[PDB]
Amino acid sequence: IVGGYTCGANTVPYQVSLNSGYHFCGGSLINSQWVVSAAHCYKSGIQVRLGEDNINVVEGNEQFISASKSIVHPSYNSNTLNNDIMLIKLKSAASLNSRVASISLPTSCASAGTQCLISGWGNTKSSGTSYPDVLKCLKAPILSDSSCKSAYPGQITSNMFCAGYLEGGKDSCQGDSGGPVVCSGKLQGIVSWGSGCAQKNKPGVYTKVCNYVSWIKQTIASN
Ligand SMILES: *[O-]C1=C(C2=[C][C]=[C][C]=[C]2)[C]=[C][C]=C1C1=NC2=[C]C(C([N])=[N+])=C(Cl)[C]=C2[N]1
Ligand SMILES: [Ca+2]
Ligand SMILES: [Cl-]
C-alpha cells in the first residue's frame, strides 16, 4: 500500500496473508473454512495465515492453516486478468473471534464515489521496493466507469472497477494482490492489477465481487 497508514493490530480481522515461505498475496476470510483471493496468486503449497499484524513476528492471535484446495475461476484469463478470483478451502476451520472474523459478500454492487478500505503488506514505494512488517490501510473511492476506461482503454471488462486517486500517491501495489476492498462492511473488490503503483491517472483495478456471489456460493456449496 503506497501513501496509506498502519491499520493497528487486528483491526482488519478478515485479512489473511498467503504464505509459501514468504508473504506473496493477500486474501479475505468469508466463512471459517474459505478464503477469497485473486486467481493470479494461485500456486501450490499455500499456507493461509490469519490473525496477523507483524508478518515477521509471532505476536499471538495467529492461526496458520494449510489450504486443502484452491479453485481458480474456470474462465480466468491470465492475459486479460478477466475473472481474476480464486477461492481457497482451508484444511481445518479457523476459530473465529474478535481478531479473526469473516467479511460479508455484497448483495448489490457499489457505486462510484463509495469510500472503501484497502489493506495489505504490499510494497509501500511506487518507485523501488520497501515491504512493511505490519498491515497497511488506505481509504479509497470507487471511480466512475468512464474514468476507469479512459485510464485503461480496451482493458476494463464488466468484472473490473477502478478505485483510487488519479493524482497518484496513494494506491495498492505488489504484495497487496488478492486482498480486500471493503465498502460499507461488504467485500466489493479484490486487488488485481494496475500500471505501476500510485502513478498519476493509473488507478488500481479490482475484481468486481458482486458479479461472482452466485458462483462463490454454488462453488462452496458443492465443495
Ligand atoms: O500482484 C503483483 C504481483 C504478484 C502477483 C501474484 C503473486 C506474486 C506477485 C507481481 C507484480 C505486481 C503485482 C501487482 N501490482 C499491482 C498494482 C496494483 C495497483 N496499481 N493498484 C494493483 Cl490493484 C495490484 C497489483 N499487483
Ligand atoms: Ca505475526
Ligand atoms: Cl473501452
Side-chain angles (χ1 to χ4, degrees):
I1 299 288
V2 179
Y5 59 92
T6 306
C7 305
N10 308 99
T11 50
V12 193
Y14 47 83
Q15 173 82 236
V16 319
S17 173
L18 295 190
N19 187 282
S20 54
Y22 51 105
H23 165 80
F24 63 90
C25 273
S28 301
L29 182 71
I30 56 163
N31 62 52
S32 48
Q33 220 168 340
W34 290 87
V35 165
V36 179
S37 182
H40 72 270
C41 286
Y42 171 89
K43 69 164 60 178
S44 55
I46 296 179
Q47 180 178 59
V48 177
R49 294 187 172 203
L50 312 172
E52 291 278 13
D53 182 36
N54 184 318
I55 49 166
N56 292 307
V57 175
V58 171
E59 301 175 282
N61 294 305
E62 293 98 337
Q63 288 183 55
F64 291 179
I65 309 183
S66 295
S68 29
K69 58 161 79 72
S70 301
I71 302 183
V72 168
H73 188 273
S75 304
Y76 164 59
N77 182 311
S78 39
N79 289 286
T80 56
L81 284 189
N82 184 42
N83 297 304
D84 194 14
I85 179 169
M86 167 177 74
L87 289 173
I88 301 178
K89 191 182 192 189
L90 305 182
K91 191 177 286 185
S92 37
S95 27
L96 300 185
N97 53 64
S98 37
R99 282 81 86 232
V100 177
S102 48
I103 184 65
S104 298
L105 289 179
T107 34
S108 50
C109 302
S111 296
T114 294
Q115 206 70 29
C116 301
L117 180 72
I118 307 173
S119 48
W121 293 275
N123 189 11
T124 57
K125 292 180 63 59
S126 40
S127 315
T129 44
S130 202
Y131 290 91
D133 291 320
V134 298
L135 188 69
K136 300 290 183 173
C137 279
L138 175 69
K139 281 162 168 161
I142 293 183
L143 306 188
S144 59
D145 284 333
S146 42
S147 289
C148 192
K149 292 176 166 171
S150 290
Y152 295 113
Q155 304 188 69
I156 309 297
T157 66
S158 43
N159 300 305
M160 305 175 189
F161 64 84
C162 289
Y165 304 87
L166 303 173
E167 58 257 52
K170 308 189 192 67
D171 192 16
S172 47
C173 196
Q174 183 176 22
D176 295 319
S177 309
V181 178
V182 175
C183 324
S184 312
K186 302 295 185 181
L187 179 64
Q188 292 288 182
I190 297 170
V191 183
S192 188
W193 57 280
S195 212
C197 301
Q199 298 307 311
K200 189 180 168 293
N201 293 122
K202 294 294 182 187
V205 189
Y206 306 91
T207 300
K208 193 174 182 173
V209 178
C210 55
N211 291 352
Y212 300 95
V213 182
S214 319
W215 178 71
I216 287 167
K217 295 178 172 178
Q218 290 175 335
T219 303
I220 288 181
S222 44
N223 280 279

